[PDB]
A and B are shown apart, each in its own frame.
Chain A
Amino acid sequence: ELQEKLIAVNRVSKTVKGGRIFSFTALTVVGDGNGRVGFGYGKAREVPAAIQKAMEKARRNMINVALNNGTLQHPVKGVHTGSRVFMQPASEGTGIIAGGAMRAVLEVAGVHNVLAKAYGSTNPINVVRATIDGLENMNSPEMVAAKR
């Protein structure tokens, strides 16, 4: 069934009036591997409490990547905040060559081969979004033909 992947976890600390309250954050990637992905980022006092809460949010917000022979349709360049992400399809026998933040989202996405890179800001939280955003702008011939 659905498969999860922990991108990264941050301690996170804020100076609240009365002392220091700690709240852990966590980036999770839920995906079956045949065309669906899900990014979640929830907070919690405990690490596991955030991990679980994150996976729940990731499964609530999923997208459908139109995979084609273990690859993507056309190249895309998503630009979230200061961060930037680019994607480019590649023939078989290539391998998911990209950042851990993107690869983890691509592996579960079902993508078998793809070339990518991060530009501008490289924030792990901003790159994942730019990644899922680019996976949305993705279109197929049937879509471009039907929508036209």
Chain B
Amino acid sequence: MQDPIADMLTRIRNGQAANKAAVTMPSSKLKVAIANVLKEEGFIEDFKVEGDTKPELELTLKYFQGKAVVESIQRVSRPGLRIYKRKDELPKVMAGLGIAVVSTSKGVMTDRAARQAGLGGEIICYV
């Protein structure tokens, strides 16, 4: 598709809306790299590689009483207009309550993770 990352993000923003147990999404090293921070931060239970012939990423979403584990989640860096932030440009999503995934040379990390490493990159999306 146009922007696979945005698709995945949306396909998850959708699954949570309908309170779905798990959601499929075409596999991809980059995608997996992302799903890695979502599970560590606590946005998702985890994930697993599924698919008889086609590689998929069965994502197991979790919920709680009141609000969903992931209220908001959207991509800020699209193919139409890429964005890059410096070590001091990394914005703290919701005073830190939430985090943002960035793609740097050191690898895919969050605001705090990237802030510690001391590097900046393309702001994948905010959650």
Q: Find out whether the CB atom of A148 lies under 8 angstroms from the CB atom of B96.
A: no
* A143 (CB) vs chain B CBs: closest residue: B97
Which of B65, B69, B95, B96 has most chain A Cβ within 10 Å?
B95
- Chain B residues lying within 8 Å of A117, measured Cβ to Cβ, are none
Q: Find out whether the CB atom of B42 lies under 8 angstroms from the CB atom of A148.
A: yes
Q: Which of A130-148 contact B (CB under 8 A)?
A: 139-141, 144, 147-148
Q: Find out whether the CB atom of B67 lies under 8 angstroms from the CB atom of A148.
A: yes
Residue A33 interfacial (CB < 8 Å): no
Q: Find out whether the CB atom of A147 lies under 8 angstroms from the CB atom of B66.
A: yes
Residue B18 interfacial (CB < 8 Å): no
Q: Find out whether the CB atom of B94 lies under 8 angstroms from the CB atom of A147.
A: no
Residue A73 interfacial (CB < 8 Å): yes
Residue B98 interfacial (CB < 8 Å): yes
- Chain B residues lying within 8 Å of A140, measured Cβ to Cβ, are 97
CA distance A55 to B13 in the complex (A): 44
CA distance A73 to B66 in the complex (A): 20
Q: Find out whether the CB atom of A148 lies under 8 angstroms from the CB atom of B94.
A: no
Q: Find out whether the CB atom of A148 lies under 8 angstroms from the CB atom of B69.
A: yes
- Chain B residues lying within 8 Å of A89, measured Cβ to Cβ, are 95
Q: Find out whether the CB atom of B64 lies under 8 angstroms from the CB atom of A74.
A: no
CA distance A148 to B72 in the complex (A): 13
- Chain A residues lying within 8 Å of B69, measured Cβ to Cβ, are 148
CA distance A73 to B97 in the complex (A): 9
**Mask: chain B, 54-97; 1 = CB below 8 Å from A; 0 = not:** 00000000001111110000000000000000000000001111
Q: State which of B65, B66, B96 has its C-beta within 8 Å of the C-beta of A141.
A: B96
Q: Find out whether the CB atom of B97 lies under 8 angstroms from the CB atom of A139.
A: yes
Which of A72, A140, A141 has most chain B Cβ within 10 Å?
A141
Q: Which of A69-95 contact B (CB under 8 A)?
A: 72-75, 89
CA distance A139 to B67 in the complex (A): 12
Would you give the shortest CB distance from B71 to chain A, in whole angstroms?
A: 8
Would you give the shortest CB distance from A84 to chain B, in whole angstroms?
A: 20
Q: Which of A13-57 contact B (CB under 8 A)?
A: none
- A residues with a Cβ closer than 8 A to B are 72-75, 89, 139-141, 144, 147-148
Could you show 18 A-B contacts with beta carbons less than 8 Å apart? A72-B95, A73-B94, A73-B97, A74-B94, A74-B97, A75-B95, A139-B94, A140-B97, A141-B97, A144-B94, A144-B97, A147-B64, A147-B65, A147-B66, A148-B42, A148-B64, A148-B68, A148-B69
